[PDB]
Write a protein that binds this ligand. Structure first.
Ligand code: HEM
Ligand SMILES: *[C@@H]1O[C@H](CO)[C@@H](O[C@@H]2O[C@H](CO)[C@@H](O)[C@H](O)[C@H]2NC(C)=O)[C@H](O)[C@H]1NC(C)=O
Ligand SMILES: [Ca+2]
Ligand SMILES: [Ca+2]
Ligand SMILES: [K+]
Length: 336
């Protein structure tokens, strides 16, 4: 409907300020619309901000957390002391300055920066963006963040409390297709979790299913498992979720279609974005989100490996017929 000062047209007047936030984030935060570390860090922040929400705690008479309320920024002094929130300070401070300079709430800003960041990464879907989340928050309670050494039962329970089914947990983990680690094993800083850290694709689901044969660094870091080729890092929670009977068939169905994986992820992220809010009280400004370049590569089992190297864990569905590559094993360079 409406036309914003820069000539773009939008649904509601409430969407116009986001065209300014968009320009600042692309030019500055993302250094010229790049899909590099700032995007990967923001993806950890949206999850850690939203998951501080617990109905079980509320039911027991305690404060359960406000969900996607920007509390990780507003109360960064409390929240970045939590063990799973390390390596985020510089990104939280960069976001704080954009929030304050544009007059937007921190909770909306984190959702927006996640949608805009993913648009710089090829193969990504257009995430929904809603605005109107209140800027006031209280610190998230401790212990509501799943860690890499937790069992599958522990993760599924914490995530189930928040509101996610076992399938949606698997769906949410498609974000590890654009990921690396920096704090589990600093000796192999920014070692990627899949062979394409800059392409939102299916490779993460394929490669975590491959037999662990390689130790990529001098020693094994915290919650580190043997990976399928040099340079790739494999964390325990991911290796176990790929193989556990409760999640193994969803993990397997995510391996052959980037279109299927992107739509399931988009739906799971839209649910995570309103944890603590009523989406019917928010204004939809999804039209402000730009498209990503398309990924035209087909899913592959890398470096000469075959289906014989996949530890097929879904007893009921045959493993998808995926393409093979004629090559030596790759050695992965650090993610950018
Ligand atoms: C079962 C829950 C999950 C666990 C246990 C988990 C654990 C981890 C760990 C240990 C790292 C490495 C952090 C570091 O040392 O630098 C990581 C990275 C990452 N995770 Fe997850 N994660 C989970 C869910 C998610 C979700 C739901 C998202 C977001 C939608 C997400 C997005 C990312 C991204 C993008 C990175 C890469 C950060 C970077 O490269 O700097 N993770 N995750
Ligand atoms: C959202 O609430 C936060 C927390 O009160 C506000 O952040 C402060 O803003 C002032 C002035 O704008 C800054 O000097 C402080 O440094 C900020 N504090 C923190 C912890 O970041 C923020 O301004 C509020 N946003 C809006 C749009 O009202
Ligand atoms: Ca929060
Ligand atoms: Ca990838
Ligand atoms: K679909």
């Amino acid at each position: 409907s409406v036309t914003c000062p820069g000539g773009q047209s939008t649904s509601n007047s409430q969407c116009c300020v986001w065209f300014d936030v968009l320009d600042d984030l692309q030019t500055n935060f993302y250094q010229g619309s790049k899909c590099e570390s700032p995007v990967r860090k923001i993806l950890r922040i949206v999850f850690h901000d939203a998951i501080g929400f617990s109905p079980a705690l509320t039911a027991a008479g305690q404060f359960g957390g406000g969900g996607a309320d920007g509390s990780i920024i507003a109360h960064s002094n409390i929240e970045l002391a939590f063990p799973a929130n390390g390596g985020l300070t510089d990104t939280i401070e960069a976001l704080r300055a954009v929030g304050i300079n544009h007059g937007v709430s921190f909770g909306d800003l984190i959702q927006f920066a996640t949608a805009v960041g993913m648009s710089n990464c090829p193969g990504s879907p257009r995430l929904e963006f809603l605005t109107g989340r209140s800027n006031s928050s209280q610190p998230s309670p401790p212990s509501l963040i799943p860690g890499p050494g937790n069992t599958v039962t522990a993760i599924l329970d914490r995530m189930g409390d928040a509101g996610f089914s076992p399938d949606e947990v698997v769906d949410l983990l498609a974000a590890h297709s654009l990921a690396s680690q920096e704090g589990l094993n600093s000796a192999i800083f920014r070692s990627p979790l899949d062979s394409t850290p800059q392409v939102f694709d299916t490779q993460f689901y394929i490669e975590t299913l491959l037999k662990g044969t390689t130790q990529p660094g001098p020693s094994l870091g915290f919650a580190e498992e043997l990976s399928p080729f040099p340079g790739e890092f494999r964390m325990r929670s991911d290796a176990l979720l790929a193989r556990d009977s409760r999640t193994a068939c969803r993990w397997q169905s995510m391996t052959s279609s980037n279109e299927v994986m992107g739509q399931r992820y988009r739906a799971a992220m839209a649910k995570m974005s309103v944890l603590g809010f009523d989406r019917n009280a928010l204004t939809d400004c999804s039209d402000v989100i730009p498209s990503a370049v398309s990924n035209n590569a087909a899913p592959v089992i890398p470096g000469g490996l075959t289906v014989d190297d996949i530890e097929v864990s879904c007893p009921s569905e045959p493993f998808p017929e995926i393409a093979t590559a004629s090559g030596p094993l790759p050695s992965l360079a650090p993610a950018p």
